[PDB]
């Protein structure tokens, strides 16, 4: 399914989506992707909208 990533940082806002066999598969797409792009927040997740919040 597809998993999205919302990214709300100091100098990098955005969004990026990612496929995957599960959300535990996709937090590691994504915590990969925060740590290529040099964010550092506090993250979330909501099951309901298969969505990651990181803020930063």
Same mark, same amino acid.
């Given at each position: 399914?597809? *998993? @999205?990533?919302?990214?709300?940082?100091?100098?990098?806002?955005?969004?990026?989506?990612?496929? =995957? +066999?599960?959300? =535990?598969?996709?937090?590691?797409?994504? @915590?990969? *992707? =925060?740590? %290529?792009?040099? +964010? %550092?927040?506090?993250?979330? *997740? %909501?099951? =309901?909208?298969?969505?990651?919040? +990181?803020?930063?």
């Amino acid at each position: 399914d597809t *998993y @999205k990533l919302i990214l709300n940082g100091k100098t990098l806002k955005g969004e990026t989506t990612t496929e =995957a +066999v599960d959300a =535990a598969t996709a937090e590691k797409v994504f @915590k990969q *992707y =925060a740590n %290529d792009n040099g +964010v %550092d927040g506090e993250w979330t *997740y %909501d099951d =309901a909208t298969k969505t990651f919040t +990181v803020t930063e």
